[PDB]
Structures are given as structure tokens and as C-alpha cells.
Amino acid sequence: ATVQQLEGRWRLVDSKGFDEYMKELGVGIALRKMGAMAKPDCIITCDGKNLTIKTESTLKTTQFSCTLGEKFEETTADGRKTQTVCNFTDGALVQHQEWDGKESTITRKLKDGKLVVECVMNNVTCTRIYEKVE
């Protein structure tokens, strides 16, 4: 498994636990309603160690860029400013966020041809599945 295999545009086809995850983050009602109803695309590109992830929907588009292995300031879709590091490890992209004494992990892996995106904060989990599109 390589980071290249994750590249391209992906469309959300299933979500479980996302509202619970947003509540654990303390996201307010407007962004939680938007997160319930959006069906974003995720666009992953990677040029060696330069990674970009763009989340695109009619309601909100966000994007970040980083160098794998390097700490950077991420503005999240809910507006937190986290210290983030992304790495490709054990056949998954792993994105670790730390802020104000809190931490959350997001993983992205290929399973049976789908992109499986998992999030956790304090044992509150979500799984979002995306299918490859053109």
C-alpha cells in the first residue's frame, strides 16, 4: 500500500457516527446541520511528501496542504486551529491533531477499492466511506 493509491477525487457514500464526533468536538448547531446534510467530495493529491486534501461540497469547501511528517497549523472545517501532522504509516494516511490539550486522529485507507475515513476523539468514533469518481 502506498499514498499514491489514495490520490484522486472521491465521493461520500456512507457515514456513521459523524454527528456524535461533531458533538464530542463541541461543534455548534449550524456546522452540525451542515455536516449532516453535506455529501462532500474528497480530493487527495500527493507529490512525494507534499500532501493536499480538499473537501468540496455545496455547503462548504475546505482544504489543507502539508509536508508529511511536519507539524503545521491546520484550520479545520469547524474552525479550530490545530497542530497537525500527517504521515503515511502501515498502509494508511494518519492525520493527528492536537489543540488546547485535546487530540483527535483521522485515518484514511483503501479497503476493497473504497476510501475509508475514520475519526476518533476520546473513543467517540466515526466512519465515512467514499467511492472513487472521475
Ligand X SMILES: CCOC(=O)c1c(NC(=O)C2=C(C(=O)O)CCC2)sc2c1CCCC2
Q: Residue 91: what residue type? A: G
Residues of this chain that bind ligand X (CB under 6 A): 29-31, 33-35, 38, 40, 42, 55, 57, 59-60, 76-78, 106, 117, 119, 128
What x/- string results for residues 13 through 42 when contact with Cl ion is judged by CB under 5 A? -------------------------xx---
Which does residue 125 touch among Cl ion, ligand X, none (CB within 5 to 8 A, set by kind)? none
Please give the grid coordinates belonging to residue 21: 464526533
Asked if 57 is part of the footprint of Cl ion (rule: CB under 5 A), the reply reads yes
Smallest gap from Cβ 8 to Cl ion, in A, equals 19
Which does residue 58 touch among ligand X, Cl ion, none (CB within 5 to 8 A, set by kind)? Cl ion
Residue 19 CA: distances (Å) to CA of 8, 15, 26, 51, 101: 26, 9, 11, 27, 22
Asked if 50 is part of the footprint of Cl ion (rule: CB under 5 A), the reply reads no
Asked if 61 is part of the footprint of Cl ion (rule: CB under 5 A), the reply reads no
Residue 64 CA: distances (Å) to CA of 7, 46, 54, 72, 113: 15, 12, 7, 10, 24
CB 63 within 8 A of CB 51: no
Residue 93 CA: distances (Å) to CA of 4, 24, 29, 32, 100: 10, 23, 29, 25, 24
86 versus 128: smaller Cβ distance to ligand X: 128
Rounded Cα gap, residues 69 and 94, in angstroms: 10
29 versus 112: smaller Cβ distance to ligand X: 29
Give the binding site for Cl ion (CB under 5 A).
38-39, 57-58
Could you tell me which residues are annotated as the binding site?
Answer: 42, 108, 128-130
Annotated binding site for hexadecanoate: 130
